[PDB]
Amino acid sequence: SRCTHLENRDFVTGTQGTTRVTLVLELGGCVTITAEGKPSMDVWLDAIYQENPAQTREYCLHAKLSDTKVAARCPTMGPATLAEEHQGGTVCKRDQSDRGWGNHCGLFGKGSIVACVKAACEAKKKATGHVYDANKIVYTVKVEPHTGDYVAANETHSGRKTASFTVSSEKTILTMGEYGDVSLLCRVASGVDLAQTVILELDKTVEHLPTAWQVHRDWFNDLALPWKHEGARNWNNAERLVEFGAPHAVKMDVYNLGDQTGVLLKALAGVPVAHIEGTKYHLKSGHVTCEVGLEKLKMKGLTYTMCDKTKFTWKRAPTDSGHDTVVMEVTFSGTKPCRIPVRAVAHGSPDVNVAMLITPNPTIENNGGGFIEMQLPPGDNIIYVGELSYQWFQKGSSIGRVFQKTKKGIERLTVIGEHAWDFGSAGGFLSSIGKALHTVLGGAFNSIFGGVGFLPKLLLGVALAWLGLNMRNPTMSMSFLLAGVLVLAMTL
């Protein structure tokens, strides 16, 4: 179970009937699917990449300046020109000096002057941008079932099946050993908005920096740096790093703005990073609405025997999972394979099973098995693995785990969750209207208010609320709604 490894985990139930679970697999997330009558699955968005995508506007951060050529004239003796004024990769600025007589002009006044440099770029300071084409983008969903084995992060699980997800590419029937199969109906362009998603790349060979980022396109084309495409010998807008001063009667001096890397790095304040692995430009954030069918699945090893209740040994002691569930690892020593009689009691004279098993029917295989996850109610509990027992005081609360699921559900509703109301499955007057009440709200609040900043999100909203206070017409006093909207919605 890879979902145990990371914090951002989601549990999705499956009732008798509900077999086509529409998930929203979020990158750096992991969803544990449970179902009554079906073995539990772990489905997650693993990677989002495209091998060598079409690179957009490059940029130059540190300017290379050489062959500085300056010419000056008198005011009325044919203003200054150069052959390098019109050459490529050259930055020039026409100006007027103050010609005296040591510079040898017949008249005083404003004699014209111009300075030109071969404004090339410094090596390996290119701020290269990249965009994902939906025709060649690859989502990656690795599905691992709860086999009862445990595999760490250094190792890869055997039964962990992987499918690639492009547009030449629909839904995968993964052979899940003897568990049956699973279907993964994913959608390509309805994940990350690839039109307004630019992969910024600095020098990847620089060690102590992130390799790539994920910036907005309208942000990306509104940079005031020198820009070009691949193979262009020269730059466009090369004069946005090269500065001149006033002249002193003969020469105007050229002053570079040096490197502008840190200006860019401050300007990415709150941008999700992205990874570069050779040809692959992975993302580290993203989401995808993969509908996962539980259709071919069946509980593996129902036909297996029951293990000896005496011969259970803890390979690993129980502990809190971080997700208010209990994980453990047993080892059976007798005849394999067999089924593990896992039950948990309430410690109130119960003899009552309260083990909400995350992995249903835990089985010991001939080469592994024993990793059991379950959810428990709060208080003292004894988890019986056969006759093997262990005390457990669950640290959660009665409404604390419900409040935890709402603390999940709120932070789920980020811009990932603004789109992700399809995390259930066709709620009708619950979820389909849940799309309607929030898409026209968040969408209109993405047309305007997208490109405004946290300062006006925290001040212009309160200012419009204060204009709600200072309102003449009591019927028009429903502009106080902007307090409830603009101080809460776009403030997380």
């Binding site: 951002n8 979020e26 990158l27 750096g28 997330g29 990350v192 307004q196 998603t197 992130p210 994920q214 910036v215 907005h216 942000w219 509104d222 940079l223 005031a224 740096l225 946005r240 790093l241 500065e243 703005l257 502008q260 200006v263 860019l264 790095l265 401050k266 300007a267 990415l268 304040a269 709150g270 941008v271 999700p272 990073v273 992205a274 993302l283 580290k284 954030s285 993203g286 989401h287 980020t414 811009v415 990932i416 997208g450 490109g451 405004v452 900043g453 946290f454 300062l455 001040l459 204060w466």
Partner: protein, 71 residues
């Protein structure tokens, strides 16, 4: 020559980001720039409150705005 920040953008995120506990607090530390260097102006905004305004509700809308306007 100016690159705008991603105060504007703010696409997504469940991966890793640059400075999420400082993007909002760059401006707050800049306010500390207009206070710690300008303690005489820290006293100059007191006379705004008790000697001029007499408009208790709108006093905060004067003080905070005149601090945040200072870049």
């Amino acid at each position: 020559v100016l690159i705008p920040s991603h105060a504007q953008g703010e696409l997504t995120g469940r991966g890793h980001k640059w400075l999420e506990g400082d993007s909002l607090r760059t401006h707050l530390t800049r306010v500390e720039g207009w206070v710690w260097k300008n303690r005489l102006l820290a006293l100059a905004m007191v006379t705004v409150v008790w000697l001029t305004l007499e408009s208790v509700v709108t006093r905060v809308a004067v003080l905070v705005v005149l601090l945040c306007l200072a870049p």
